Amino acid sequence: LHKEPATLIKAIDGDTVKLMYKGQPMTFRLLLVDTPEFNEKYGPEASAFTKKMKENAKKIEVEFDKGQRTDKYGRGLAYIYADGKMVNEALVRQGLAKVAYVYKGNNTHEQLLRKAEAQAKKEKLNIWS
Ligand SMILES: Cc1cn([C@H]2C[C@H](OP(=O)(O)O)[C@@H](COP(=O)(O)O)O2)c(=O)[nH]c1=O
Numbered sequence: 201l202h203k204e205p206a207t208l209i210k211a212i213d214g215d216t217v218k219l220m221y222k223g224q225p226m227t228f229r230l231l232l233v234d235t236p237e238f239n240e241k242y243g244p245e246a247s248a249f250t251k252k253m254k255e256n257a258k259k260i261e262v263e264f265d266k267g268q269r270t271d272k273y274g275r276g277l278a279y280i281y282a283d284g285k286m287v288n289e290a291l292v293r294q295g296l297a298k299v300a301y302v303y304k305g306n307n308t309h310e311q312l313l314r315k316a317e318a319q320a321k322k323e324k325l326n327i328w329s
């Protein structure tokens with residue numbers, strides 16, 4: 201897997217974001233996670249966590265996995281990093297997302313994330329409280 205540059209266009213919610221990638225605007229959906237919807241419990245907290253993490257980053261990177269890079273809605277599917285720190289993992293580690301949508305061949309960081317979720321749940325963080 202390889203990290204590639206991108207720039208924030210606009211935060212959207214917990215697990216989607218509008219980025220410019222290879223010079224083109226594109227909505228990205230974070231791999232391997234599910235945050236609550238904005239109108240659901242912890243949904244505004246997820247949105248807020250992702251917004252700050254990206255808006256504060258001096259450097260955003262996109263990391264595609266081995267399989268599908270685009271979902272059926274045209275959303276880019278990637279691991280997203282903010283100053284070298286993975287947003288997907290950080291959401292899970294804070295109990296602001298569940299590990300989810302783990303499809304064969306786009307699952308490189310599954311075990312890293314499941315270990316974050318385990319710790320989140322142990323600490324009864326947020327969704328696990
Ligand atoms: C995260 C992810 C979602 N999607 C699809 C599955 C779900 O389809 P349906 O819309 O038919 O339920 C939807 C979940 O996205 P959201 O969690 O953003 O709704 O996106 C993928 O196809 N691949 C993925 O890696």
Ligand SMILES: [Ca+2]
Nearest residue numbers: 215234235236
């Ligand atoms: Ca969601």
